[PDB]
Structure formats: C-alpha cells, structure tokens
From a paper:
Totally, two NrS-1 CTR structures were determined, one in A-form and another in B-form. The A-form crystals were grown in P212121 space group; per asymmetric unit contains six copies of NrS-1 CTR monomer, which were assembled into a ring-shaped architecture. NrS-1 CTR assembles into ring-shaped hexamer in both structures. The helicase domain forms hexameric ring in both A- and B-form NrS-1 CTR structures. NrS-1 CTR forms hexamer in both A- and B-form structures, however, as confirmed by the size-exclusion chromatographic analysis, NrS-1 N618 exists as a monomer.
NrS-1 polymerase is a multidomain enzyme and is one key component of the phage replisome. The N-terminal Prim/Pol and HBD domains are responsible for DNA polymerization and de novo primer synthesis activities of NrS-1 polymerase. Here, we report two crystal structures, showing that NrS-1 CTR adopts one unique hexameric ring-shaped conformation. Although the central helicase domain of NrS-1 CTR shares structural similarity with the superfamily III helicases, the folds of the Head and Tail domains are completely novel.
Author numbering:
A (entry chain C): 305 to 500, 505 to 718
B (entry chain E): 303 to 498, 506 to 635
The structure:
Amino acid sequence: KDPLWLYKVLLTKGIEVWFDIKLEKYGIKRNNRVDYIAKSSLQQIVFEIIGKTPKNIAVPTYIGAYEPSKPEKWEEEGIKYINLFKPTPLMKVKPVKEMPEIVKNLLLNLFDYDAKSMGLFINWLAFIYQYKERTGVAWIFMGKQGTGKGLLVDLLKKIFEEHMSSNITDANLDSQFNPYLYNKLIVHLNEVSADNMLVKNRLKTWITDETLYINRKNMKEVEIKNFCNFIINSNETIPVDIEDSDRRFNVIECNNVLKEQEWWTTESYQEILNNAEGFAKYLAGIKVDRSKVNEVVMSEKKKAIVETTESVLKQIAKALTDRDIEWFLDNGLEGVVEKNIVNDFQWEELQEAITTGVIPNKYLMIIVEQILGDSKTITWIKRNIITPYQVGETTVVKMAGKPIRAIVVG
Amino acid sequence: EEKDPLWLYKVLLTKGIEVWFDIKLEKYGIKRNNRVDYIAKSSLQQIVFEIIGKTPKNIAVPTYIGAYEPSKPEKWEEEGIKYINLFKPTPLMKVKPVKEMPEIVKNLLLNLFDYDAKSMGLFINWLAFIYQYKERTGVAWIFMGKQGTGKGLLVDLLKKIFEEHMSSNITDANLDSQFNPYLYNKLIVHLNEVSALVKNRLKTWITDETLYINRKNMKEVEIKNFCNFIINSNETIPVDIEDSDRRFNVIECNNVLKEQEWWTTESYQEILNNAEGFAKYLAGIKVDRSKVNEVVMSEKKKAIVETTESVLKQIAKALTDRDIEW
Ligand SMILES: [Mg+2]
C-alpha cells in the first residue's frame, strides 16, 4: 500500500529515518543527534521500536547535506535534501550588547588590549556564529603558553560543540581520514615544535576552497561544501609559510601570561567557561560588518615572520629594482669602506650605481659579497638574483673611456 | 518467469530517473535532474522501493558503459557496445552566445595579464575552446605572482561556470593521496602551489590520451582524458620547465586588485555575479583552433628556464656557440 509507512511510524516516535543515496547509508535523527548506519544496523533499531523486521525499509531517499543557513529539509532542483546541521544550545540564544566582563578581560589580554584587531576578530567570530559561512580568513595566535589561547579554544568549543574541531595536530593530518573537517564551522589546529615540510600549508587552500574531499573510515570518500574557518595556536614556531602579500592570515602574538595579571584568580579559568552562554549571547547580538570579516592586517608579528621567511636574494633583488640604497646601508654595506675593499672615490661610484640602477660587474660582486658575507661570482649573482627576479639585463656601458660590463636595472 | 527484461528501466524513466548497470564499474548508475551517481545494488533496491513500492529480486535495467564524452550525445553505440554519458552540461554551459564581455570581468582579466592583449586573448581562445569544444588542449596556464591579483578569483569565477567539471585548489597533499577523483570527469583542473617538485607528473596529464582513476570503494579504471590544467603559484616554481617547452604558458601578475582605481568592496562579489555574462561571452567566441595549443616565451617563463637549467650546460653551450660575449 505505502512506500513510506515505516518513515511515518518512526516520526510518530520522534525518529527521522532516511536512505542517503550519496553515502548509501541509512541516516537516523533523534534529539538533534544524527547518525549514519548500515541497513542491518537499522533493521536492528527498527525491530526494537515496532517489533517487526521488514525486508523492505520503507523510508524516503534524501541527500544529507550540512547547510547551516538552510531549513531541516529542502529541494534544490528535483533533489530532496535533508540537513545534517542541527544548532547547539548556545547557538539558539537571545541577543545581547554587553560581553561578560571576565570574558572581555581574556579577549583584551589576548590581543594585548588592541581594539582594532580584537574587534575585527569579534566581527569574524560573530559572522561565523551568525551567518555560519566560510570567511576565507584564518587567525593565528602565537606566543607563550597560558596566554589563554587554549582557553579561548575551550570557550568557543563550548558554544559550537560538535561544529568545532579542537587541537588538531600534524599527526591528524597524516592520517588518511579527516573527519575533523566533516561538518565543522571552526577548525582549531595546534602547532607543537621547534621547527627552526610545514604540512599545515595544505590548510591555506582549505580556507578558501568551495569544497573539500572527506575520507572517513567505512564511509565513501565524499565531496562536501566547505564551512570551515581556521584558528591555529602556535608556540613561537611558524606553522605556515606566509607570503609577503598575504590575504588569508591574521597573526596575533600574545605573551601576556594570565597568571601574571592582577585580575587572575584561581576560579577565573572556570568562571570564563561558565560565561560561554554570556559570550554566545554577545556574539549573537553583534551587528556584522560583512566587509571587515575577510579583512587582514599586517600585525607586527606577521611582518617579522615575512621578513624572515622571504629569501634574502629576493630582498637584494628588490633593493636593486627599487634603486634603494637605504636598504643596503641598513644591511651594513657601509662596511665596504671600513675594510678598504674600496676607496672614498669608488664608494661614491658604488652608491651612485645602485641609485641610478646601473651597476658595474666589479661593484655588483663587491655589494653581494658584502651583504652576504662571502664572494659570489657574477655568474652566480646572475643565476640566483638578477635573472630569477628579473632585475635587469647584463650589458656594456662606457664608464670613463673604458667599456664596462654592467647590470642595467629595469 | 519474465515478460520484459527492461520494465523497471522504463517505469523509472516515466518518473525522470535513468537507471543502468555499469559493467565497467560493476556498479549501478542512476541519473536524475542532471546529477549522476553510482550505487551498489542494495542501495538501488532501496531507491526503487521508495519509487514503486516493490523490491524486485531482479533489477530489470539495461547494461551500458558509462563514459564522460562531452561532445557525444546522451547515449551511443561504438562498435557493438552501448555507452551512456556521464557528462551533463551545467546551467551556464547551456547559455546564449554574446560578443561583449562583462566590463568588471574584463577589468579582472586585463589586470591579470597586465593589460597584454596577446596573451590574454590567447587565454580566452583556450578557455573558449575548453568551454565550447570541451576537449583536452595539451597546454596549461601557470599564473604566478603575489596574492590578491585575482588568480584565485578567476578560479572561483570559472568554478561557477564549470561547476562540477572543475577541480579547485588541488594541492601536493591531494596528489600524495592514493585516490584521485580530482581528475574524474573534469574539463578544468586547478592546482595551488604553496611551497616556499611532485607536480612534474602533470606534465604528462596535460597530453596523455587517458588517465587511471583510483576512487575509494570503486575499481581502478582507465578513462579518456578531458583535463586542462591551471596552476596558481606564489612565486615558487611549481614545475621543472625545459628550455624548449610546449606545454606551459606562464603569466606573472603582481597587479594587486586592492591597489587599482576600479576596485570597490562589491567588486569581488560583482565579478562572480557576472559568471553568466562571462559564460555567454565565452560561448560566443569564434575559436581559432590553431592558437589553442600555442605557447609563448613570456618574460617569466624565460627567467624560470635560465635559473632551472644547469650552469654547466650554459658553459658548454657558450663553448659550442663559440660565444665569448656570454
Ligand atoms: Mg595514459
């Protein structure tokens, strides 16, 4: 008579069953807990609940999908979907405008009291909480332990519960499975090393990729819409190679240990966590600037990281290109004069050369020997500076009367 | 017992579902609303039940071979073998030709090729060909240079047109994975270089008639290759480029978008909303077929080669060429 009788009878009892054509797995939903089970396992559940093991599981075929904004069910095109996102308690909570004070002190302590970046993070966090989308930006919190980086994780972990992954390590990534990304709004990573590959570089795409592949054990490899947002806690060690011109990472050094503050009592740690609801309420009541979510800033620490990560040869080439003497002097070129590698006259010619962007071989070698600490041949300097960073062309120019081999910037 | 060996096939066609058994994959295929899935038998029996109210012991459907042939019809019969098509066009693939490209999209493209018509137009001729003719080009494009030049935006833009036919932001990690579905039924395959060179295998993917496809819970299977490769990199060479190279166009772009006049906030999003516009434009190109697989010695490609190639080679060549000047 009826292809869905069993569906309905189990709905009568507050269980929603379906077959998930995508995962070829029967899904089941009670009390905002979603599980996927094989058929036999369902038959075992069904038996317990109606006292009959039917040969045919009379349930609808949906596609389970983690769409936080969308309803309990919907039908894109001709396909009926069912939702795997169920909001946590503290996601369904009444807006407020004040943030709990002890929570505020944590956040202040953490951003070293800098409103700009702190407020930007709250705008990010709010957007994630409220709109529940991918930002395309990630936050790195580095600096010494006990600065409440880990506490911020626990705090958030409470608000988001199942939608957050916590303390994911390099080891978890080397695992062939990766359920730490399945149905996650926030994904926290811990770095723990003395690094100085940086396998968390793979993350950079995750930040911005529309979709992820999800290999789970005993499940099909499946591609899903990406709702991930990434926080990374680090020791001092840099966890990701940061390009100069970077748009994904906000970096926040915090070395304000909590136990060295006035306001820190014993019960503070726990007090903070008890105010999770308070901080949820606050986040729910933010008025979200949508343009500031994916904004990044050149914090002091991000700059230090870049100027150490980027190749010294690049930095030379850029100073050659920019005709930027000041850089070379900042990096101790003036030492050429002290050691009598060159006289007062030639030193004028040498500086002139950098600025004008016309550099005789014997000055180029003198410069690059002096900046780098041992002598490099023209050949090397060409192959490892001038050529790869397109500084310019090797040519002749007549200086005085003699024709001189030179590099002509441009 | 049986009167008709395909009754079930037909009844499910009545309801706009096309079911078959793939001999190649020994997996039952199913097609609704231009979404193709492959499922085990039990899973099909579960679907069938829901739709007719009867679980038959025998799945009365035709045996075809699923094949991703974009040019070819919904079905055909090479030799004596009936095939069924896994290519279904996305919305913006079926869209009406035009001759003007949306202006804000044009500014992206201009920005990206540093306003160089030659190479830019060549890329449009490539992209058009892929869009229109839907074949393997045998050429690939590398976009390197600093972030926020709209390399990533061009990927999202195209990702909207091609949808499921393009793989996005494939990394070294994905390649070290034993599976590789990022090549299964793909017209475009985008890669991110992030290191500060395992992608040399792509060299061959660009030109190989066929690929092996290891997918989880599926048989390793060999398929006709429709891949075309874009690689975003961030100043790190992703692939060893031979002096005399015919596969790679390289395009350095350091024009950050946020440093242009025309860049507003809503620009990022505006660009993506014009995906349909840019699709329409691509559909209306008149494709020079000889220029598709053309490559050029951009400034950056040369720099890459003269740094990649061995100094000892360069000495020897100067000895050979009797070239004092070098
Ligand atoms: Mg092959």
